[PDB]
Amino acid sequence: YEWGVRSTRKSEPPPLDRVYEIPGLEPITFAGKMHFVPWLARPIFPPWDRGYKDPRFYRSPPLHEHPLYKDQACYI
Amino acid sequence: QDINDTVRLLKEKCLFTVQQVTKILHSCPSVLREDLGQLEYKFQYAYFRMGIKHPDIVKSEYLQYSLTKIKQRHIYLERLGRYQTPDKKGQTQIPNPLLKDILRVSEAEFLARTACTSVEEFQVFKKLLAREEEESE
Amino acid sequence: ARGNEYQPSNIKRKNKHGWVRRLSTPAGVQVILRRMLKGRKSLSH
Amino acid sequence: LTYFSARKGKRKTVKAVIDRFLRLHCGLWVRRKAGYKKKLWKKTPARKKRLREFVFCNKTQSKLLDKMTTSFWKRRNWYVDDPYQKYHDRTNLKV
Amino acid sequence: TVIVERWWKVPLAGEGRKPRLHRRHRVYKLVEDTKHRPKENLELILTQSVENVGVRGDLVSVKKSLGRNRLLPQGLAVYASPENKKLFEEEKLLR
Amino acid sequence: ANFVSWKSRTKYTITPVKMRKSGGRDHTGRIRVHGIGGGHKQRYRMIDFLRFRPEETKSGPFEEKVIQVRYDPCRSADIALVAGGSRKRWIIATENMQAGDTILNSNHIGRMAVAAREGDAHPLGALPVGTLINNVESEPGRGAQYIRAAGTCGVLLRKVNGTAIIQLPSKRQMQVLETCVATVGRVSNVDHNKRVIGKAGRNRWLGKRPNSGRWHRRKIRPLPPMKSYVKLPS
Amino acid sequence: PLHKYPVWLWKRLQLREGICSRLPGHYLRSLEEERTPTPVHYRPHGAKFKINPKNGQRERVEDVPIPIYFPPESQRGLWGGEGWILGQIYANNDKLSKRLKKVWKPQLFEREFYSEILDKKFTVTVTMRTLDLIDEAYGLDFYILKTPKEDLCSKFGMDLKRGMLLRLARQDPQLHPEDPERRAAIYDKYKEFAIPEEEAEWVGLTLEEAIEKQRLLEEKDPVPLFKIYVAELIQQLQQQALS
RNA sequence: GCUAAACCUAGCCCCAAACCCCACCUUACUACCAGACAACCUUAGCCAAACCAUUUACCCAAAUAAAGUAUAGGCGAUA
RNA sequence: GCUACCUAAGAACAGCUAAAAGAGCACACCCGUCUAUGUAGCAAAAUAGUGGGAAGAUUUAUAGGUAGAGGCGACAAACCUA
RNA sequence: CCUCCGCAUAAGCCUGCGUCAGAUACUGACAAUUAACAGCCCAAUAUCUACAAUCAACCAACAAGUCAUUA
RNA sequence: GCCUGUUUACCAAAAACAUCACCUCUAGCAUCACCAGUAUUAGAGGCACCGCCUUCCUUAAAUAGGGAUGGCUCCACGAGGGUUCAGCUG
RNA sequence: UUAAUUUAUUAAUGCAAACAACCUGCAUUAAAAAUUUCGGUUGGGGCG
Ligand SMILES: [Mg+2]
Ligand SMILES: [Mg+2]
Ligand SMILES: [Mg+2]
Ligand SMILES: [Mg+2]
Ligand SMILES: [Mg+2]
Ligand SMILES: [Mg+2]
Ligand SMILES: [Mg+2]
Ligand SMILES: [Mg+2]
Ligand SMILES: [Mg+2]
Ligand SMILES: [Mg+2]
Ligand SMILES: [Mg+2]
Ligand SMILES: [Mg+2]
Ligand SMILES: [Mg+2]
Question: Membrane spanning segments where (chain E)?
Fold first, then answer.
């Protein structure tokens, strides 16, 4: 029995537009419009990086990348 | 599908409880072979014309017997005056004979203890009823 | 006994008849459009 | 009937009248006798002969039929071999 | 495919005009459902030996299911187009 | 409606979880089940129904210590906090489960039948025929779903091949692979039947709303040959 | 008052005004032209005239198409011009009985199709009519390239058409790279459908998509007036020096 | 003689012609944080048929005429 | 935003008798048995007295939810902005 | 002589008996409510959290409950 | 009518509705209600706690009132419908 | 409601379709409903 009901789990992203499956053509998305419209393909935005260090919007590295991380598990 | 439709006829169209249907299947396996429509007619014959309620229909293996025998004996008694269909209130002038006394007993015992008539008259009535059924169909 | 069916509360007022809720559905958008066409000074509540 | 149609504004014709009555251009309306095809086995020869006849209509009936039909049905028709060509006009009629 | 037909005939529209439909023209009756038609066969030209059908370059009438599910998807057969027929004809006459 | 299920927690824990009542309403806000609403506020204790759940980086049969047996507001049966290795979990306590007792959870189907001690979990194949069981799975590793109410106990009626026939408390036969695990003995709180609600207020505390005041009166439709005898006048 | 133009000509006027005017001529013609789709849900009359049995006279006959509803799911698949028939029926097929709403839906299958030009396999929700059309066309590529927009009636189908046409127009080496002979064979097989890339780029684009494409094409950050004035002054000085 | 009464233009109707700084979707008019939900889907009924149940005219791409004709229709109201 | 029910998280319940009570008497509070006034009224259902409950199936503030071929209902066909 | 009340907070309202000058708590103008009270919050990733409240101690329980952190 | 409670907001508060208790029917089961539940459970409904077996009297006059599986059974309670002692009183 | 007409809708099955299930088409059976009506005389009521 898994904990966390599907309806509460994060919704799956909508399926990609079929236009993206055609090798030779560049899809026409609403990225240029800088806003969503329902009759254009949904852009695939590249991952974004803030570019600097903002303390109030900090995203710590994964636990495995911390300097003090150790395979041996201490018990505190 | 045959088994399921038999069970569905017994439950939805005959309003037998689940336990009642299981007991009916246990006691009268021939119901499964019996075709639909005929089974419903037999049950409604017991229910309306004979005024037998589901607990009695199940307790006495009424569905075991054949519709021909059931109609023969029951209509013979009804025309003789021994049997009487219950009224709207479910009451009868004279208590009706028991289903075991009608169907389970042999022909001679049924004619002597309950009908109190002659085998010759019973044969004549059986032929007449068969002719009437043929004409009706 | 009757008459005071209105028990004012700005939270309920805005959440029930506000601009955001009217735009939240196509029917509310058409409500706002009807008010604009009629020339209502107050489009929403 | 429809005095002004919704598409042309014209007066319409009750086609039930056209399917049943003949108009002679003189203004008379001819018809069959009701029941002339019904249960002939129980009707006497004289009654059958009466029923098999083509019959004129009343003045009021003719007026009603004229109202119910438009002018197109009240024109001169020079059909090739019309059996009613002679009957289309009146002769030796005083008032 | 479901093929339907109007219960009520649509009045002629004209040459350049479009027919004007009404509520009664939306009433349909099913004349035929193509899926219930008897199955036909697909003509294919085999490219590789396949059990119980043929060897290579021979026209074969195969059940549409087999043609569209195994032969064509796996390349064991090609459509019996005029071009393919010609090419396999040259193959045969060269062999 | 803006209804989101409170069953959103993803990681198992021992803490009672604040649970939101439904009132018999769907996520759409409409009543779907009647007679539900109100009652005492409750906190949910996540029960681990997969009693053979060997700890991380561990395997094989393991023992556990019954830390305590507690009343569960969300169940008829009472629960038991039980600890093994370096973890604690809630389970459904059996009739004679006591604090400080030892519990065994094994996946070993021994050639001989294992001595059935109440409270431990063995695969159904390892139990002697006729032993009382509960917290039975439908499939291997699915998790206990049957025989979970207070005082209920199924019977391991038969074992043939890899299939065991169990008698559910409703006296219905059920076929389950003998590798599926079940716990021995009858569920706790056996006297739940005899509890007397005493007053309508106690039901309202339990969260059951009163039945509808409407008076509810199907019927066998007579066949044409029988329509003449339906309502014979007196 | 009265509008200067009929309301039904407003779309055409909008096309003749604005960025839609700047759209390429061939695309505008493709949008404007409309052809009746091939009959799918009705059997067309064989001839234009028919001798009606009632009065035995010759009468003109017309093929009035059945309105078809195409749910958006269709645009993600390849239905052979097939769609939902939202109509009405007479219970027991007699006009003197009740009239009931009736929706006839097509039987949809999930099938995998390989595109030779695109060298890709697509899983598409498809109809038996579409499969029959593909068989008649001798392949998915031929079916897509032959069937016009109206008959194809699928946004995914038109996108496949655009991709195939662009591939053919560019003679893209990305088709089976390292196999030039196979690439040339495929292009020769589908040669007849090749069209100029400038036209293939706009095949199957909706009006909104074409507008967005035109805007992206013609969007340019304004040139600083410093450059323009420097060029103008330098040219003027050149003229002054020469004359 | 009080209440009053009187007014003429504010405008409107029908056609023709002609195509038409800042803030604001959060509680709108709110300077400034991790998105994702996005749209399309037979009008119905009143009413007429003297009830009503099949049926009952409606931005259609040139006025007129063919013509209320051919046709449709509980072959009836009507179309 | 009334009202029917529900969800989240709150709040109120003097005093006496009893003892851990859907207990008794009785404030606040909720209700509305009977009488009188009033009846274009203070009031489109009120006032005075009298009365039922008043630690519970209680009352109640806040926000949210269920919407009409529906909702909600300890069925009165009650309530869903007089 | 009355006191059911009253003073504050909440909610609601929005200048609605403060001054001046005029009409007959109205009009026009002028002024005014100053934050400590209250609202307006929280950097991530995992990980933590069984033991009510009731003077919380006896005692009694049932309807089984509002109060927490670590690396 | 078991009881406490609920109801026709604005003419009916009741014997009506609910109600513990009992009875009937349906269901062998997971990730949005039932339910993060599992037949001692859940839903639908009936009925109503529990418990059992199978001519005279009142007045002087009293169409008022009381006594000689269901069915019976009034302990307690009631602004319920009747009757009544004594007292009290315009 | 055992008034008339329907199954549009759900639930089942059957036959097709397609490769057991799902989906679609066509049937059958139920549940649920939907539209519409409830002639005339005989003081009312019952039976007539
Ligand atoms: Mg309120
Ligand atoms: Mg013309
Ligand atoms: Mg009418
Ligand atoms: Mg107190
Ligand atoms: Mg009390
Ligand atoms: Mg009632
Ligand atoms: Mg009533
Ligand atoms: Mg009572
Ligand atoms: Mg009471
Ligand atoms: Mg209530
Ligand atoms: Mg009232
Ligand atoms: Mg009252
Ligand atoms: Mg008296």
Answer: none
Three-class SS of residue C19?
helix
Among F116, F163, F120, smallest CA distance to F138 is for: F163
Beta carbons within 10 angstroms of residue G127's beta carbon = 24
Whether chain A has a CB inside 8 Å of the CB on G159: the answer is yes
Distance, in angstroms, between F8 CA and closest chain A CA? 5
Q: E63: domain CATH number?
A: 3.40.5.10
Q: Look at residues B47, B3, B50, B5 and name the one whose alpha carbon lies nearest to residue B29.
A: B3
Give the C-alpha separation, E22 to E11, whole Å: 11
Q: How far apart are CA G167 and CA G200, in angstroms?
A: 9
172-201 of F, contacting B, C-beta below 8 A = none
Chain F 109-128, CB < 7 Å to strand K: none
Q: Are E73 and E47 in contact (CB under 8 A)?
A: no
CA distance G166 to B10: 67
Kindly give, in sequence order, each residue whose CB lies less than 8 Å from that of residue F116, ignoring residues fewer than 6 positions away.
F122, F127, F128, F131, F184
What is the distance between the alpha carbons of residues F227 and D43, in angstroms, rounded to a whole number? 44
- Overall size of chain E counted in residues: 95
Q: Where do runs of H (alpha helix) occur along chain C? A: 10-17, 19-24, 26-38
The set of residues, in sequence order, having a beta carbon less than 8 Å from that of D90 and lying 6+ positions away, is D26
Per the CB < 8 A criterion, the answer to whether F52 and F9 are in contact is no
Taking each helix axis from N to C terminus, what angle separates B67-80 and B119-136, rounded to the nearest 10 degrees?
A: 110
Please give the Cα distance from F44 to F13 (Å, whole number): 11
DSSP assignment letter at A23: T
Per the structure, the complete domain to which residue E79 belongs is given by 42-95
Resolution (A): 2.7
Question: What positions of strand H are covered by protein, i.e. any atom < 7 Å from a CB?
Answer: 15-20, 24-30, 33-44, 53-62, 67-79
How far does CA F69 lie from the centroid of its chain? 17
Would you say B109 and B124 are in contact if contact means Cβ atoms under 8 Å apart? Answer: no
Non-local (6+) Cβ contacts of G94 within 8 A are none
> Pick from G208, G213, G161: which is nearest to A39 by CA?
G208
Instruction: State which residues between 73 and 102 of chain G bring their CB within 7 Å of strand L.
Output: 91-92, 97-98, 100-102
Task: For chain F, list the domains and their CATH numbers.
Answer: 1-106 (2.40.50.140), 107-187 (2.30.30.30)
User: Is the dihedral angle over the CA atoms B88, B90, B94, B99 positive or is it negative?
Assistant: positive
Q: Are E3 and E29 within 8 A, CB to CB?
A: no
Quote the longest CA-to-CA distance of chain E.
67
DSSP per-residue letters across B34-72:
SPTTHHHHHHHIIIIIS---HHHHHHTTGGGS-HHHHHH
Q: Which residues of E37-49 are buried (b: 16+ CB within 10 A; e: fewer)?
A: eeeeebebbbbee
> How many Å apart are CA G205 and CA B100, to the nearest integer?
83
Q: How many CA atoms lie within 13 A of F210 on its CB side?
A: 6
Architecture of the domain whose range is C3-45: Orthogonal Bundle (1.10)
Tokens for D37, please give them.
Answer: 């095809």
Q: Are G221 and G183 in contact (CB under 8 A)?
A: no
Q: Where are the beta strands (DSSP E) in chain A?
A: none
Is residue B132 within a helix (H) or strand (E), and if so which, with residue range?
helix B119-136
| CB-based contacts of G240, cutoff 8 Å, min separation 6 | none
Count of CB atoms situated within 10 Å of the CB of G210: 22
Contacts of F12 in chain A (CB under 8 A): 3
Q: Return the sign of the alpha-carbon dihedral for residues E67, E71, E75, E76.
A: negative
Residues on chain G touching E35 (C-beta within 8 angstroms) = 107, 128
